[PDB]
Symmetry: C3
Subunit: 467 residues, 3 copies
């Protein structure tokens, strides 16, 4: 009876810490490199889809964002890299990044009219600009009111709002910075104006800045916007002697958990995922992926590898223990029932036969190993892509430094874990053949000649009942 190990037509290759390009009978890749090329719903909830609009564009009601979808609940934001329709009237948005991060993910979101336009009797309310032109006519941010002089008079404009919505409300306001003192007087009459905003938490007084600037969309003037979270049951007070750009609406918002923004050109598709990249969604149990660094969801660890191949079967031969590709020179393509087994040449016939108990125990072992590498990986929801202003470069560099930091830790460890485990595995199979061999040799004792090639030549006669 002969002792041998399985061999097949496999051309799969793995490396170990001692050998590269070793051919094995079976292998498991543990690096996910496939997506589905689709922007999907994350955990059952769609993304907010901004088209060519930016967040500021959208919130303020740039007329060019009139046709936006708007869902009441979203799980991330889809925004173009360099949108197109933002502040149609030129200016700036204070703490814009914090806002985007606030809005990035929401359980509920609903726009409500909080200070209706027509309540500003005493003030004119129809001022628009050609920078926000619809059909060549002057127009303005659909969610905001430009308050100007009426008749030739601008009385103290007061307006408050008690947040009885039932949820936290995001409110936005603006300050108009004129281009010249003339523009100032023709608009507001008063010359030493201020704009005042107040809650239980907020106290802000702003004074318009009247100066000549380079024209942007045809204007030396600017509008500076700002925001706040009006708490439940708190009240907001607006008071201005000119230059106020009052909100008509607010946004009850209720969140949730915080997510992120995804820069893409694509459009939602009605598939499902727990892990979205800008190239498509990943759906895996694997520990690592190399698809794209900017994921949103619960994702495998991003790693720099091209491949991470774990050996599972043995060395395919057409070791620490000296058996495989050792004193048993090669494998048996004829043995198909298992990894290790017997040959046995009889005067009743020949044949091959796997040793079911020792192949099953090797299989459970290798199954347990693969499962350990895979299920010990802890995966938690993260956004990754982040937003910093032009004055927060250090902070952005901090974040890159850190992201690169984990990239290198995970890459080194994954490359190496794989290298080291492959050599143990190959040694495991070697040990297993060696042990099956020794288990037979310890029985047959003197009754057989030990040929040296893993074969035992019986002195006596041994038929099927003997085998």
């Amino acid at each position: 009876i002969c002792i041998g190990y399985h061999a097949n037509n496999s051309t799969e290759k793995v490396d170990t810490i001692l050998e590269r390009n070793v051919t094995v009978t079976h292998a498991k890749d543990i690096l996910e490199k496939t997506h589905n090329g689709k922007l999907c719903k994350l955990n059952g909830i769609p993304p907010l889809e901004l088209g060519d609009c930016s967040i500021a564009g959208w919130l303020l009601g740039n007329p060019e964002c009139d046709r936006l979808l708007s869902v009441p609940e979203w799980s991330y934001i889809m925004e173009k890299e360099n949108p197109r329709d933002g502040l149609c009237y030129p200016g700036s948005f204070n703490d814009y990044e914090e806002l985007k991060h606030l809005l990035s993910s929401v359980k509920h979101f609903e726009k409500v009219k909080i200070l209706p336009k027509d309540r500003w009797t005493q003030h004119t309310t129809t001022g628009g600009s050609r920078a926000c032109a619809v059909s060549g006519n002057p127009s303005f941010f659909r969610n905001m009111v430009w308050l100007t002089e009426k008749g030739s008079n601008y009385p103290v404009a007061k307006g408050s709002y008690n947040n009885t919505s039932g949820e936290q409300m995001l409110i936005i306001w603006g300050v108009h910075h004129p281009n010249d003192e003339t523009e100032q007087r023709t608009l507001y009459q008063n010359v030493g104006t201020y704009v005042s905003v107040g809650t239980s938490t907020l106290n802000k007084r702003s004074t318009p800045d009247i100066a000549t600037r380079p024209k942007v969309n045809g204007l030396g003037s600017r509008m500076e916007f700002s925001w706040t979270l009006l708490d439940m049951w708190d009240t907001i007070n607006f008071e201005s002697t000119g230059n106020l750009i009052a909100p008509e609406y607010g946004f009850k918002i209720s969140k949730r958990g915080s997510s992120g923004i995804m820069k893409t050109e694509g459009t939602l598709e009605n598939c499902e995922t727990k892990c979205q990249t800008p190239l498509g969604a990943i759906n895996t149990t694997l520990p690592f992926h190399n698809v794209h660094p900017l994921t949103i969801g619960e994702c495998p660890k991003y790693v720099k590898s091209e491949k991470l191949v774990l050996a599972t079967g043995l060395r395919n031969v057409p070791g620490l223990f000296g058996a495989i590709a050792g004193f048993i020179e090669g494998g048996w393509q004829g043995m198909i029932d298992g990894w290790y087994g017997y040959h046995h040449s009889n005067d009743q016939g020949s044949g091959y036969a796997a040793d079911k108990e020792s192949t099953q125990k090797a299989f459970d072992g290798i199954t347990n190993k693969v499962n350990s590498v895979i299920e010990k990986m802890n995966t938690q929801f993260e956004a990754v892509g982040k937003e910093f202003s032009n004055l927060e470069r250090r902070l952005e560099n901090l974040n890159k430094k850190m992201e690169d930091g984990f990239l290198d830790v995970w890459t080194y460890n994954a490359e190496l874990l794989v290298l080291m485990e492959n050599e143990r595995t190959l040694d495991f199979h070697d040990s297993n053949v060696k042990n099956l061999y020794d288990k037979v040799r310890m029985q047959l004792r003197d009754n057989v000649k030990e040929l040296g090639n893993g074969c035992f030549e019986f002195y006596h006669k041994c038929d099927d009942e003997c085998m």
Copy 2:
């Protein structure tokens, strides 16, 4: 030739098998605390009770009874205190101030602008928002209103001769209405002006109607600075200034953190404090609580990290243990590996002392490497960010979770990988004990195959020892 077995029900997992029973094991995952808030390296924490740092430094009257030490290693503060800005308002760079105060070598209050030297101004102002016994009071540390119907330019200054750096706080009053302004300060276009060698700051009050907070529409906006040794701070104001009377000498140190908790100091010791209790361990990992202060183990998302130290209990790469030697010997109590021997003078179990000792050193070392290579430094973990700092806080979470994942994955696999190497190690030891005996006896014995050698010749106690010894011939 055989190996140890016992009644151990201890389990470990390894990279190939789960739920393996081992004669011995070592847990290397600390998961216990003492339930106490303790002194940190022999230094107490500041106990704010129901007070905020702001309330405490401003002099909120509800804070009169605070303990105050001249030195502390962290700060204890409740989640959402209660006694903060009794008079509604705000505190610029409050979070930067907390981090600075979080740990102090020395901290002494010093009078820098005596209340009574403000002649020309009324100095008695207060509010029912800061009420003590239904009477209007004010921040105990802070002080300026019109006197007669006049608010002359108010100027105060102080040269830091205190021999240390000094924390100095000051305020601006924002009134609810112009009437409130004129009856407080007479003047209208007023300002407050703080200056040092380093700081230049001018503020103007915001008069305006606001939602009532403790019945006040008005607000108080506080700011601070560190006055250097021998530098001077200069206040100037035509109205609306809330001046400091006191300053705080401050010497640091190394920086720490605030601990959000409801407890109270208890007089024990620790090098690692957690919101649940103190941790006293040499163990490389714990899972007590993420928000720790001190020199702590790595925080890991694990329920158990159990490292086999003994062999597999049997009441492997090397085919001996639970292999060609089917079972253990509870009979053998001296060591891990040994001999039985059957004589015409008796029977016996005896452990092989040399090989047991070697393996023991071996394992001892393995446990010590896993444990003593863990580099532990002082850290606070728990951090403070304002509402307008949500990205920053999110970066911090991303980091703490990143590291939480790296150490977890690493601790789980190390334990799995080393557990199987250990069991394999015991296996190799017995194979080698067995092989060592085989290569001596040679022909003089029948090799039964259960790990036993039957002697052709007769082998008394003397010759038994010659086998267990290395001797024999």
Copy 3:
């Protein structure tokens, strides 16, 4: 006659540690922790660093007279700045977003100073004002790149000036506001009392008012100058308007970049060597996965780590084990065997000898080389800066940076140490296994014909000349003979 299986021994005294043992003497060892530098500050990928001398970046950009002599190159890869220079803001004051400025300047593909608002064009204004705080040769002077605008005649007409960025590149621009000590100063300098400084671009809208107040004197001044900066995009325009107190730029700096680097705090001076990795003590030239030289490096560096040594066993246990061969049933090594790691003795009636088994020595050698290379070449190295700047109101942020850098410190050290402790034992076991296998290969051939002494040797029952020995080492041998038997 006997043939013996055995293994190499040498005079090495090199020690490694393994998960199970400590201070194990091996015949060969490879260090993977870099600890040597060259003492020099160098060009970094062929590109010199900007050398600032006793100057700070602020002082260099403003044109502190005391920085007049600075070399200045149109491209650098990192900046050298002393810890606490000396020649910064000669006139007391501040610089907003200073730290961001330094970050952006740290590393520049192109840098060129250009004249954007010629001092002489400020007719209607006085332009010659200076201070003895910026004094050259006892005389008042000023920031060489900046213009102090003051009253002329007794008149300060509104000052308007602009610059369209036709330079071809982004341009750094800096301006200042003078904050007087008192109202009389204000009037003697600018006539006007309610002044503002206004600065605007497509992107920037800023209006300041001078703050008039008594402050402690610095360099004898109660006044302060506060500076601000902006990057003007190509084809954008910057507008300055003021009725007083404006400190106006004469120059701007065209800037093209790049990839961003950092500042190195050092007293040293550039020395004309090369490196891809610069540290404050010296340049590092290495292929090694880890270093312990200095935490604050610039370039592509091995991973900094808190260890004193990381030595990897490459040879075997030096004895002049999992498989029981080495320092096992074969008690010792052979100093006499020089040719390889494992081989044969053999003692004939044609003489004695040692000989390495070349095939098994070469395999092992290939194996160990593959292991070292793995540990070494899987390390991914990219370009980083490390050293960082934070203002005094940014201590939490600095703590975040520190916690991060420390956190990675604890990961690499722990992992580096343990990888070495684990690989050393595997290396020792591997050599052991190799010998065991060489041993068994001979046992299986020789069979019955020899006596197995239990020490690694085989005593033959027959006679075995050199051609016979050869057949044993060759794997040939056989065996019918036999003799004896008889």
